[PDB]
Design a binder for these strands. Structure first.
Lengths: 343, 284, 292, 121
RNA sequence: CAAUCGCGAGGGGCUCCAAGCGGUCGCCGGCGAGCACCACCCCAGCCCCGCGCCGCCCCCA
């Protein structure tokens, strides 16, 4: 419960560990106050979030060096959060338990190794059942190979058409299908049950389209039940759409954003919702304090945070907590900072 | 014929002399359990326990368990011919040339279809479905049924009237099983290659090089690890997508719009404040 | 010597149905260098060789009646519309050219639209409905159009050529369904059924090793018969799957044609072994036959 | 309607707006209807795009006349917002004109682009 | 790098020498980088294919 125009954020003490590369991915645990930090310097860190800790607040649980990979993305798996799947640019990806301590190397996606020469651009569904990989072959299109993580086996494929393929995609919050931001302005509301596209619709004026997030409650249950979608472009404009206004299954081919966000001038590189569906933090990594924060459903940018003097750095990754009360920002030099949010 | 446990961490292998259980997590054999020959099958008990069911080549029904050595004393010989085939359900049924349950050609094998029961009998080219190419092996999945038959050649016919040819093997097939959620058809062969039939978008991807040994494969109780029986007297619990053996067994409103409510018609000649209030509250 | 086009007169009494073949000399032969031929019913056949002329053929005269031509370049495909008539003929230069079949005359009517890239050579067409067209391309794209307005519906772009060498997926054959979907038989061996309401793909069945040059559907939308640059044809049944594949043929298979009438539901294939070869539709029924 | 050189959304619009953006980065770009009109009347213009998403399209219908007089190719894209952030303006650009110089790879891209526009008209 | 093996310009009568250059097995050899040798576009070039001019040779004249 927080009002639209002025936020009660505050600086919690930062993470002690510093990385030798930029922070490529952050992820909070979905059950516990645990931060997973992961950089291009081959190292992941787990930190427990206790601000009254001693000797060093926000202490370190463990520090995993993964050999020879540069960690592009690490992610918790499931609502329980018992696995961490992580991947660099290399042709394999690991999964790791949190209940048994098993590192497994998935090195073969099942007859699609020609189709995949990375594993870096993956997502895992909110129900934890499935996990989509961007297949790294374009020639005028882009496909998502869907993995069953209970077996780690390919079961489905999610090709859309564009120039340079998929920009960025998001699982439906029910888990029953996808929504895929391509690189021409086409956004595909894909369905997993029918394994077919529900409908293709265009962003408002996107040249390229760079990133994409999704989330909220009380949305279209035939489109996964998640309410808001934000799509960011090469021009730094973030368009925010209510997904209840894609239905007229007949998807509106030219819908209107609920709000055009035009504050940032350079290419939107991060976008995230708070998992209660009340905040949208988006930003760029080509200017210094290029991080903005948006109240939803009202679609207003908060004007008091950040300031001139908020230490952010060139923001490479952000992450909201499981209770939507701690924000994490990791930058181009390798330092996580944390902010509690009150409401 | 090898079989897992209900809690996945125990593998179960019959030899030509005894029954040996194994740790899927850590080590080799746990129990040498006595089982003389003075072997047809061994499955688990279905409804309440997980004891065992072993049938020898003639009628001697061993009802024997792990977590003990109990059951080394009680066979049963209710049937008169040498036992050929054997299947349990929940309720036991045994193929002798015909069934006894609780026909033209030579029998091969017999398998049982789950709780709303059905029976699948197997002669050479005949196959008997019961509601209530020359065969080598076959598996099945329910939910309303699908039957994958192998063959003495490398053709794997699939049935849900018309089969489907899934021919890969340059000899007999020795193993055909449905994978997990039914997406893949994991098959084996004489030529050491464990083929993963895609059965979706019709591709094939496999585990080629191995100890010249593939016959009698089995699938985990979950979608996880397949255990392989292996003709060099070896079993091999392989976790999935590793293909590495785990076990080897050998109200926001901008102020300027309210300023725009109060810009024109300065104090006098303004609309009355019922109307101006309707402008303001209509802005809010 | 080789087959390049097969077509049946009808596909549904003593009603004169005939079979029209195109032999790679330039010949045409009818059973009870040319490149394509169709019939029209409301019944006369139209053919193209590699040149831009699209010509009718009078049968009782056995002479090339009523040639047609145009400006653009080499016709590589053409086809006639269904009913709720014209011809649509796609070429090398990216034009698709409408010809008029007003009551008896074959006219160069109109060029509706054309791709911006000149390097998009069309290969085949099929008609998803009455007034809207599906065309394969020499790039990975297959593309829909409307001839009410000429407009350019959704590019249905295939991938890259993964298996080695080239980049472009050259889509050799495109056919349609009574369900409303369309099969695209591309290069690199694969087939893929694309959905019809949203014009996206729904299934990518990899069967062949080399490029499927021709395919044809049943008249009830039940059996799909592919035929490739291998020696190989393959059948497909219900979203789909294949059943089997037997090398009926000896060279690549170049042209299919199906018929489902008179108690004789056969599909005839021809390629470059100079031997036309006829199949049933009931492929578990009995054997096949061949004719030369 | 009056948009008879309508550019097709299958990537011809995308190559138009991309060349708009690259000419915007080479400063070869006259933005808006009035400055477009000045570039066509002065004859500096090498190609000109309009927007068919104009709410009254009469306010950009005047430049196809003088583009027919100066013999420069014009073509319509269906979104003035896509043209607007294709330019990089933060407002809606309704009609854009893009010139050339003696030697640039951009001038080569203009040449191939109005070759495609000539394939339309 | 270490063991090992091969060919052979060039010169001399199947043999002889040699400039050189590669392969295999071990490297508790070291260095460098990992989508991307890709996507979008443009300018050329190798090759293969089309069509018409010349350069030459012809035969009558």
């Amino acid at each position: 419960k927080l009002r639209p125009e002025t936020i009660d954020i505050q600086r919690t003490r930062d993470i002690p560990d510093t990385h030798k590369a930029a922070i490529s991915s952050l992820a909070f645990h979905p059950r516990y106050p645990i931060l997973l930090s992961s950089s291009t310097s081959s190292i992941m860190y787990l930190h427990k979030l206790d601000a009254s800790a001693y000797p060093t607040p926000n202490p370190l649980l463990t520090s995993v060096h993964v050999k020879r990979t540069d960690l592009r993305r690490a992610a918790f798996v499931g609502p329980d959060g018992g696995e961490i799947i992580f991947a660099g640019r290399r042709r394999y990806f690991h999964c790791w338990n949190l209940s048994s301590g098993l590192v497994k190397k998935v090195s073969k996606i099942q007859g699609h190794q020609k189709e995949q020469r990375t594993m870096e651009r993956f997502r895992v569904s909110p129900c934890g059942r499935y996990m989509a990989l961007v297949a790294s072959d374009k020639k005028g299109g882009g496909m998502l190979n869907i993995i069953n993580v209970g077996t780690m086996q390919w079961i489905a494929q999610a090709r859309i058409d564009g120039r340079h393929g998929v920009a960025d995609f998001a699982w439906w919050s029910d888990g029953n299908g996808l929504t895929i931001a391509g690189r021409d302005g086409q956004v595909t509301e894909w369905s997993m049950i029918t394994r077919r596209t529900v409908g293709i619709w265009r962003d408002e004026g996107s040249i390229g389209g760079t990133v994409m997030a999704l989330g909220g409650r009380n949305g279209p249950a035939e489109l996964g039940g998640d309410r808001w979608v934000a799509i960011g472009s090469n021009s730094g404009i973030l368009n925010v759409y209510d997904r209840n206004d894609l239905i007229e299954i007949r998807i509106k081919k030219y819908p209107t954003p609920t709000r055009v966000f035009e504050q940032l001038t350079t290419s939107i590189s991060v976008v995230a919702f708070s998992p209660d569906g009340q905040l949208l933090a988006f930003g760029s990594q080509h200017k210094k304090d290029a991080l903005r924060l948006v109240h939803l459903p009202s679609c207003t940018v908060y004007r008091n945070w950040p300031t001139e003097q908020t230490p952010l750095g060139r923001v490479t990754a952000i992450a909201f907590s499981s209770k939507s009360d701690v924000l994490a920002v990791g930058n181009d030099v390798g330092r996580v900072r944390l902010w509690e949010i009150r409401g | 014929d090898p079989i897992f446990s209900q809690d996945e961490r125990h593998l179960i292998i019959t030899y030509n002399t005894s029954i040996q259980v194994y740790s899927t997590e850590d080590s080799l054999l746990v129990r040498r359990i006595a089982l003389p020959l003075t072997i047809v099958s061994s499955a688990l008990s279905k409804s309440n326990p997980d004891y065992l069911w072993v049938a020898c080549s003639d009628g001697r029904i061993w009802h024997i368990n792990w977590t003990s050595g109990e059951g080394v004393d009680t066979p049963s010989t209710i049937d008169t011919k040498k036992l050929l085939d054997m299947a349990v359900d929940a309720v036991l049924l045994t193929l002798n040339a015909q069934i006894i349950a609780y026909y033209d050609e030579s029998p091969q094998s017999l398998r049982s279809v789950a709780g709303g029961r059905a029976i699948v009998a197997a002669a050479k080219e005949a196959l008997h479905i019961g509601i209530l190419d020359i065969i080598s092996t076959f598996d099945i999945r329910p939910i309303d049924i699908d039957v994958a038959v192998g063959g003495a050649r490398g053709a794997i016919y699939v049935y849900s009237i018309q089969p489907r040819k899934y021919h890969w093997h340059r000899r007999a097939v020795h193993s055909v099983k449905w994978s997990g959620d039914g997406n893949y058809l994991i098959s084996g062969g004489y030529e050491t290659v464990l083929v993963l039939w895609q059965l979706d978008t019709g591709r094939v991807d496999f585990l080629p090089h191995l100890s010249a040994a593939i016959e009698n494969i089995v699938v985990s109780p979950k979608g996880s690890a397949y255990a392989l029986h292996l003709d060099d007297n070896s079993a091999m619990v392989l976790s999935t997508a590793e293909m590495k053996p785990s076990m080897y067994v050998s109200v926001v409103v901008a102020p300027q719009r309210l300023a725009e409510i109060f810009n024109a018609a300065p104090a006098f000649a303004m609309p009355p404040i019922e109307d101006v209030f309707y402008q303001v509250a209509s802005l809010f | 010597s080789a087959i390049n086009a097969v077509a049946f007169t009808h596909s549904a009494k003593n009603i004169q149905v005939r079979l029209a073949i195109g032999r790679a000399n330039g010949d045409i032969e009818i059973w009870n260098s040319v490149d394509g031929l169709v019939w029209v019913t409301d019944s006369r056949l139209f053919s193209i060789g590699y040149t831009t002329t699209i010509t009718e053929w009078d049968l009782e005269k056995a002479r090339a009646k009523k040639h047609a031509s145009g400006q653009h370049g080499e016709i590589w495909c053409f086809g006639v519309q269904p009913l709720p008539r014209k011809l649509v003929a796609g070429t090398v230069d990216g034009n698709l050219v409408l010809y008029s079949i007003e009551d008896g005359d074959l006219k160069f009517q109109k060029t509706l639209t054309r791709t911006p890239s000149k390097k998009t050579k069309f290969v085949s067409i099929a008609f998803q409905s009455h007034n809207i067209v599906i065309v394969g391309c020499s790039n990975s794209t297959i593309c829909a159009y409307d001839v009410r307005t000429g407009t350019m519906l959704r590019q249905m772009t295939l991938g890259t050529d993964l298996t080695g060498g080239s980049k472009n997926i050259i889509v050799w054959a495109v056919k349609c369904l009574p369900n409303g979907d369309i099969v695209s038989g591309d290069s690199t061996g694969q087939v893929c059924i694309w959905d019809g309401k949203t014009y996206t793909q729904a299934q990518r069945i990899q069967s062949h090793t080399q490029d499927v040059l021709c395919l044809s559907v049943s008249a009830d939308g039940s059996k799909i018969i592919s035929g490739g640059m291998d020696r190989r044809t393959a059948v497909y049944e219900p979203r789909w799957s294949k059943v089997f594949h037997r090398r009926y043929h000896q060279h690549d298979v170049k042209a299919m044609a199906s018929f489902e009438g008179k108690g004789m539901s056969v599909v005839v294939s021809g390629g470059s072994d100079a031997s036309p070869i006829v199949l049933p539709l009931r492929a578990l029924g009995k054997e096949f036959h061949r004719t030369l | 309607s009056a948009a008879w050189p309508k550019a097709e959304d299958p990537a011809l619009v995308q190559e138009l707006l991309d060349c708009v953006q690259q000419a915007s980065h080479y400063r070869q770009l006259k933005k808006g209807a009035n400055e477009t009109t000045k570039s066509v009347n002065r004859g500096t213009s090498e190609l000109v795009i309009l927007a068919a998403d104009t709410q009254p399209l009469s306010i950009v219908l005047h430049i196809p006349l003088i583009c027919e007089e100066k013999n420069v190719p014009y073509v319509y894209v269906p979104s003035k917002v896509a043209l607007g952030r294709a330019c990089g303006v933060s407002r809606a650009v309704i009609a854009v004109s893009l010139t050339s110089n003696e030697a640039s790879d951009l001038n080569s891209k203009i040449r191939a682009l109005r070759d495609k526009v000539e394939r339309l008209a």
